[PDB]
Design a protein around this nucleic acid. Structure first.
Ligand SMILES: [Mg+2]
Ligand SMILES: [Mg+2]
Ligand SMILES: [Mg+2]
Ligand SMILES: [Mg+2]
Ligand SMILES: [Mg+2]
Ligand SMILES: [Mg+2]
Ligand SMILES: [Mg+2]
Ligand SMILES: [Mg+2]
Ligand SMILES: [Mg+2]
Ligand SMILES: [Mg+2]
Ligand SMILES: [Mg+2]
Ligand SMILES: [Mg+2]
Ligand SMILES: [Mg+2]
Ligand SMILES: [Mg+2]
Ligand SMILES: [Mg+2]
Ligand SMILES: [Mg+2]
Ligand SMILES: [Mg+2]
Ligand SMILES: [Mg+2]
Ligand SMILES: [Mg+2]
Ligand SMILES: [Mg+2]
Ligand SMILES: [Mg+2]
Ligand SMILES: [Mg+2]
Ligand SMILES: [Mg+2]
Ligand SMILES: [Mg+2]
Ligand SMILES: [Mg+2]
Ligand SMILES: [Mg+2]
Ligand SMILES: [Mg+2]
Ligand SMILES: [Mg+2]
Ligand SMILES: [Mg+2]
Ligand SMILES: [Mg+2]
Ligand SMILES: [Mg+2]
Ligand SMILES: [Mg+2]
Ligand SMILES: [Mg+2]
Ligand SMILES: [Mg+2]
Ligand SMILES: [Zn+2]
Lengths: 288, 201, 49, 157, 102, 123
RNA sequence: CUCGCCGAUCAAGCAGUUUUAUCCGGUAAAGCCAAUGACUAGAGGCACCUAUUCUCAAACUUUAAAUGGGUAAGAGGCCCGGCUCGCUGGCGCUGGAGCCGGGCGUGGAAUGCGACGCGCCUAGUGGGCCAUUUUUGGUAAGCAGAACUGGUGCUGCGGGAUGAACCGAACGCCGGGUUAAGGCGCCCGAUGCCGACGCUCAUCAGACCCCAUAAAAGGUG
RNA sequence: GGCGGUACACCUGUCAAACGGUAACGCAGGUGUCCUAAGGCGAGCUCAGGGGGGACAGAAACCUCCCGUAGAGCAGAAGGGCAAAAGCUCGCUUGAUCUUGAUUUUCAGUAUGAGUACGGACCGCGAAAGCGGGGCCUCACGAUCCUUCCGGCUUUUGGGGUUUUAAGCGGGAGGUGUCAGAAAAGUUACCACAGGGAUAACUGGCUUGUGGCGGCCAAGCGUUCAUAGCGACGUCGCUUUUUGAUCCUUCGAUGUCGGCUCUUCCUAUCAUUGUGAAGCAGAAUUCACCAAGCGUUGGAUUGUUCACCCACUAACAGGGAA
RNA sequence: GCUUACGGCCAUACCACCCUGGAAAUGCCCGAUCUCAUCUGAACUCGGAAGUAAAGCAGGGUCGGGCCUGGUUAGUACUUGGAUGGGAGACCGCCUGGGAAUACCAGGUGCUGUAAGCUA
């Protein structure tokens, strides 16, 4: 069988971009998202970056530059325990809060927290903030889903709804919000308000506790020890949205000084490298 | 056929047999290695060439004739298993022939293949034992009369058909830098994996 | 009765006879071909200052 | 007679370098081209839109118009014996900033500071480039480098 | 080359995209009292023979198809000629392509 | 300089240049010395002609004109361009070969200090 | 005709040229143990498979010249303040462009030149030919077809005996002097040198750009 | 010249000598089409090939794992480009629409064709940024007059008015492939005219493929022995008594095939004179050398040069001189 | 120093095999009620937190392949311009300038911007 990886293979081999080899960036969609028109002359084109891990949600606002895009404001999902949400830091309701936390924190540093307060109450209807004359214009950014398949009800659009309710003017439509019946092509806003306030999570805690309590303890183990029940879901997120709108500013942790103690071994120098093969040759000639 | 005086000088760009040039007849020479070709490097230390001194092109029929002329003299003076002839010129340039005759559409059909040679390029190479030097020079001398132009019969300083000198070939064998494989040697540098170094020892 | 097809023999001597003059770059270049959206606003920046 | 096609003879100029194929790196898209800067022209076979003609690949002109995706350039093209200023529309993937004037701008900024430094100190530093002058008189020491005898080598074939 | 019998194109009289009825354009019979025909008969009358060139060496095989886009608006029955590239076979009804078929 | 040396290299087959000494610079401006007063080949028969044209550069006589050319000064361009090209005669004694380079027995090219011999036979 | 004429009292600008700075290319060469295509020979591992090897490409190439093409080398600059806009927009400067005012000559590479500046009218020509180099078809051609430059056509003169184009050199009428290329036995101006060294004998000697013919192979001359 | 071909309008690679341009009846080719999707957009997916496997099942059916820089595919010729694309599959679609100017390319910097970047409408797809005014790019096409259709928030039909009709302005189409666009079968040996050595048929000239002639090397032939006499495979030259190639001279004319006649020259010598060599015993014959002084015939058939035969002969050699 | 989000240059970053590591974080992992989703909860989407390093990932190892850089190849090949240079010719030498490429040899193997967190 002929060898596929020979000298002629690697000599002709052209590697992809590093962010492409890692599978993190889609350069076909990035070009159409971060590149600004040439008749704008360094007008920053902002975008909301929403990323999901197995335990955390990252929401950032950036604008592209040649030496790397700068992050204007970043709100993480592990900051919700400061506002009350100590459980389920990766569900749809926690995505609406980190988007709201990113919207209110951005408007704070830009001096736009008095104007464009968004929807204080959660109604689920399509809301797009309006720019009032005389006052500074609303912040207009765009959504960056990345490699996440944008289906109806994805949590990427949960932070999108949290940002447009905070005051951000992001263009979108209610076709991909949870509660859009594609059969009738109508958006039922009442279903969306349930996912925003975690009401769909409460119905799961009740469907298990009233059927078999054994599985309820495995699925919601940390929900029991933290003292949150199925009846304390809607109110928990409501008072969390209130705390986010009050103090959205995030202070950095005190810089802890470290002696920079390395835990990895260093590369072998040229002396240690040649001396090792010199010992293997000498040890090979003694055995014969 | 047309005499070789008409296709002696390299006037045209190289016109090889390819997808665009179809219908080329087979070259006159088809065998390039003769003698005991499956001999090791330490059997035929001597090497002698037929170096060219003119930038011209040698026909395929001349390479065939001079090969047999040098071969018939080596088999009678050194035996059929005491030499190795390697013709180092392959006929690749296709010379053209105009229609048998105005010149409306004068581009001609292929006539044959002709090997283009440079000043200093080896035409033939013969390796044999160290005591057959006077026979190879005479065998290669008789083959010059089958070629147009001027050729030189130079006894090379390399070790047979290899590219290493004779004064260094014996030292590179003891240092395991060269291993014989058929009619040539393998240059084994000191920059590979250590597994193949232990195989040599 | 064939003739000569194409030639550029004496052309380089005729070009440099009166010299090869570069285009005259005048101050205040023209404004034809510019973006009509940009020119429409620029004419509004001149009738208001 | 040759064909008058727009891409005849562009087999190698519009090709991409070895092991440099694929998508365009996203730095060429985020470069700002104002109106009146010197830009080069170098066509790319990846973007078949707004590509320049082969008579402009390698030329250099100044920008007179900027649009959404492209840039209007004023290139001087000699036709037969006359040089004409051509206004062409080339997208930003086939152009780049010309560093031919950056050596002049850096030299001006260094001149504007040398005269204000000599004015407040009272010197006469000359601000003007000069060709490579003949080498001055210098002593060549032979303390540790004695002249080594060279001579032609015999001919060997 | 088949085109559908319906087009949602721009209507110049409605100044808006409207559904259109697609139909192939036919030249129609010549009028006997057009200016060019009224002077061609008068010039060719009497003696002298044929006075106008008669085109003989035809070279084209097919011609460009013209679509007659008529708006389906009840009050705006505005037509418009739309031309397509040359084609030797043209059907207005046609059947849509089917990929996954034997 | 490197700007002018490459101009002499590109025109070697047509020139025969070198390094003139003082006597060559001296005798060329005295015997073949003609000044360009107003686009005219006026003979330098009086220092009033030099002081009128090159008075701003400090050159007020024919000796300053020689010193400004032999020892190249800050006003070499104004002094050299003031002098009309010297109309030298045919070389008395003949040339070696006008076609080949001086190194290969001819006359063209660069002769370091042997240009003085060519001046005495042409001036 | 508009100017400069006054030389960098002045702004200058220009160039079949270099220098400095920055881009463009895929030809010569090189490579094929790198891809596509062609190709010779053994060797190892159980026809293939791996590592080598000989020879090539004009419609192949990793690499890649020389020559060459474009641009930039200042007042139309540099810097600062204010104003205008329906364009742009988190951000009366957020970009952008326009407008107005002020500050700053050590005109900020070499060489050369009045700008081959701005127009108008316009004859002739639209069969070319030759050479160095590059190059296509052809066995070749005082052949046919291209590229750069020169010549000639339109051009006489010194030299090549002779001559369209070769070498030198281009031309008002003359005196003197001196050269080019080429020459200096005599025709025929000049070696009528006590020119230097060596090679060479030919019963077809040899005698110099283009150029007016000579080869392979041989000689104990 | 004719016949053939289209190098007549266009496209790819090369020629082309590293910007662009650059010729020949240069080279290898392609075009007068195809597509309601093979146009537009979004999403998902990864291809060619190879290996291990898996009822029927095999070298080719289908399922599945692994490797797989694209070595596949992208309607066609070729080149370039492309991998969460530009390929494959799928569901929504008509930016293949309506408009003014600028501009690139062939260029005279004219038209047309084909392209590029915008402005103003109205829309498609997408969560969105965005993308799209046909096909991934380089090709796939057409003036004036006339006809025909569409459009007007409209004009004239004239001494007014009304209605038909006709004319006009704006945009498509009908087509000129000789493709910047005549409506067009031959013959002339009965031929004419204006011209052309810009151009053929003679000589001459350059060229020598071809023809003829002569060397070099030595496998072999020669009973044996490479070279007395020959010289395969190769290769170097000469000649202008072959025929081409070219088209410089000659078309206000150079009389043109053969024979007859007559003179002269050349030697690549058939004979004779003087010699060398042998597979030279003699005779005969063959090879070669100095050598063109001298001779080289009479006839049948054919217009023939060239052939073929009959006899003679020391031999009946080969050519040049327009 | 490390772990993530978004990147710039796009192999000094890739490829094969081996070894070590979980503080935070990351990954695997546990479920199919809701949203969504396929032949199949594998993927996609969604809900979650019992386990903690097998793999991803990160850091090392290889007289590693590749890539990058330098030396050398070589002032060689080739080339601008010049001659009444050589040569029957093919072609070559010289004068005046520019000046490569493989093989071979050696060294190196990601750098870095913005934002957040942790001191294995
Ligand atoms: Mg070598
Ligand atoms: Mg002509
Ligand atoms: Mg012609
Ligand atoms: Mg001319
Ligand atoms: Mg072509
Ligand atoms: Mg009648
Ligand atoms: Mg000359
Ligand atoms: Mg000025
Ligand atoms: Mg003409
Ligand atoms: Mg004319
Ligand atoms: Mg002549
Ligand atoms: Mg010619
Ligand atoms: Mg001719
Ligand atoms: Mg003239
Ligand atoms: Mg002569
Ligand atoms: Mg005189
Ligand atoms: Mg004489
Ligand atoms: Mg002999
Ligand atoms: Mg002797
Ligand atoms: Mg054809
Ligand atoms: Mg060129
Ligand atoms: Mg638009
Ligand atoms: Mg001849
Ligand atoms: Mg012959
Ligand atoms: Mg025998
Ligand atoms: Mg013989
Ligand atoms: Mg023979
Ligand atoms: Mg003959
Ligand atoms: Mg003629
Ligand atoms: Mg004789
Ligand atoms: Mg003989
Ligand atoms: Mg472990
Ligand atoms: Mg390595
Ligand atoms: Mg290297
Ligand atoms: Zn309508």
């Amino acid at each position: 069988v002929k060898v596929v990886k020979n000298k002629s293979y690697f000599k002709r081999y052209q590697v992809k971009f590093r962010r492409r080899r890692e599978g993190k960036t889609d350069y076909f969609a990035r070009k159409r998202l971060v590149i600004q028109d040439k008749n704008k002359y360094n007008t920053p084109k902002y975008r909301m970056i929403v990323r999901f891990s197995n335990r955390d949600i990252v929401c950032q606002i950036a604008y592209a530059k040649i030496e790397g895009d700068m992050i204007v404001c970043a709100a993480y999902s592990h900051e919700l325990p400061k506002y009350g949400i100590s459980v389920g830091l990766t569900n749809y309701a926690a995505a609406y809060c980190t988007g709201l936390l990113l919207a209110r924190r951005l408007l704070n540093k830009f001096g736009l927290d008095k104007v464009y307060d968004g929807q204080v109450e959660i109604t689920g209807d399509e809301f797009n903030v309006e720019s009032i004359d005389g006052q500074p214009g609303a912040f207009t950014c765009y959504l960056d889903a990345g490699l996440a398949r944008t289906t109806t009800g994805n949590k990427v659009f949960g932070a999108l709804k949290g940002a447009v309710d905070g005051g951000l003017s992001i263009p979108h439509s209610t076709k991909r919000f949870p509660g859009y019946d594609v059969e009738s092509k109508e958006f039922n806003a009442e279903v969306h308000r349930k996912h925003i306030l975690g009401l769909n999570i409460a119905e799961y805690m009740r469907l298990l506790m009233e059927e078999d309590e054994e599985c309820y303890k495995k699925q919601f183990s940390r929900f029991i020890k933290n003292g949150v029940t199925a009846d304390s879901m809607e109110e928990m997120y409501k008072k969390a949205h209130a705390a986010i709108r009050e103090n959205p500013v995030h202070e950095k942790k005190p810089k802890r000084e470290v002696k920079k103690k390395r835990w990895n071994r260093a590369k072998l120098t040229l002396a240690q490298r040649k001396d090792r093969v010199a010992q293997k040759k000498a040890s090979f000639l003694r055995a014969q | 056929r047309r005499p070789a005086r008409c296709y002696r000088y390299c006037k045209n760009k190289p016109y090889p047999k390819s997808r665009f040039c179809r219908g080329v007849p087979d070259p006159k020479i088809r065998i390039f290695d003769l003698g005991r070709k499956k001999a090791k490097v330490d059997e035929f230390p001597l090497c002698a060439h037929m170096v060219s001194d003119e930038y011209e092109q040698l026909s395929s029929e001349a390479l065939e004739a001079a090969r047999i002329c040098a071969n018939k003299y080596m088999v009678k003076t050194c035996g059929k298993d005491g030499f190795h002839i390697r013709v180092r010129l392959h006929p690749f340039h296709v010379i053209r022939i105009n229609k048998m005759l105005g010149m409306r559409g004068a581009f001609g059909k292929p006539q044959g293949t002709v090997a283009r040679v440079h000043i200093g390029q080896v035409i033939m190479s013969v390796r044999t034992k160290a005591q057959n030097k006077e026979h190879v020079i005479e065998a290669l001398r008789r083959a010059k009369f089958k070629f147009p132009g001027r050729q030189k019969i130079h006894v090379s300083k390399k070790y047979g058909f290899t590219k290493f000198n004779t004064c260094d070939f014996d030292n590179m064998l003891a240092e395991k830098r060269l291993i014989p494989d058929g009619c040539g040697v393998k240059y084994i540098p000191s920059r590979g994996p250590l597994s193949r170094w232990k195989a040599l020892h | 009765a064939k003739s000569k097809n194409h030639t550029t023999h004496n052309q380089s001597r005729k070009w440099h006879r009166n010299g090869i003059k570069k285009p005259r770059s005048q101050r205040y270049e023209s404004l034809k071909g510019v973006d009509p959206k940009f020119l429409r606003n620029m004419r509004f920046a001149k009738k208001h200052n | 007679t040759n064909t008058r096609g727009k891409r005849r003879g562009t087999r190698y100029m519009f090709a991409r370098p070895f092991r440099k194929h694929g998508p365009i790196p996203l730095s060429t898209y985020m470069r700002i081209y104002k109106k009146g800067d010197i830009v080069d022209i170098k066509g790319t076979g990846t973007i078949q839109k707004g590509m320049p003609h082969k008579c402009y690949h390698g030329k250099t002109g100044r920008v007179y118009n900027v649009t959404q995706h492209a840039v209007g350039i004023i290139v001087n093209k000699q036709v037969k014996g006359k040089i004409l200023a051509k206004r062409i529309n080339v997208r930003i993937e086939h152009i780049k900033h010309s560093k031919s004037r950056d050596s002049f701008l850096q030299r001006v900024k260094e001149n504007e500071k040398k005269k204000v430094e000599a004015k407040k100190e009272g010197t006469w530093i000359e601000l003007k480039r000069q060709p490579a002058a003949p080498r001055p008189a210098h002593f060549v020491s032979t303390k540790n480098n004695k002249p080594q005898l060279l001579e032609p080598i015999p001919y060997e074939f | 080359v088949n085109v559908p019998k319906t087009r949602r194109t721009y209507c110049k009289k409605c100044k808006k995209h409207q559904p259109h009825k697609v139909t192939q354009y036919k030249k129609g019979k010549d009028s006997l009292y057009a200016q060019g025909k009224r002077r061609y008969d008068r010039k060719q009358s009497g003696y002298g023979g044929q006075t106008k060139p008669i085109f003989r060496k035809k070279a084209k095989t097919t011609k460009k198809i013209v679509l007659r886009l008529e708006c389906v608006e009840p009050n705006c029955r505005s037509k418009r000629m739309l031309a397509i590239k040359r084609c030797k076979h043209f059907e207005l009804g046609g059947d849509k392509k089917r990929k996954g078929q034997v | 300089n490197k700007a002018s040396i490459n101009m002499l290299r590109i025109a070697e087959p047509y020139i025969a240049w070198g390094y003139p000494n003082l006597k060559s610079v001296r005798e060329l401006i005295y015997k073949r010395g003609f000044g360009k007063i107003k686009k005219q080949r006026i003979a330098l028969t009086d220092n009033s002609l030099i002081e009128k044209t090159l008075g701003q550069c400090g050159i007020i006589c024919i000796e300053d004109l020689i010193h400004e050319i032999y020892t190249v000064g800050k006003n070499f361009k104004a002094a050299n361009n003031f002098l009309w090209p010297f109309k030298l005669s045919s070389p008395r004694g003949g040339m070696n070969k006008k076609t080949t380079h001086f190194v290969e027995g001819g006359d063209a090219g660069n002769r370091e200090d042997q240009i003085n011999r060519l001046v005495r036979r042409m001036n």
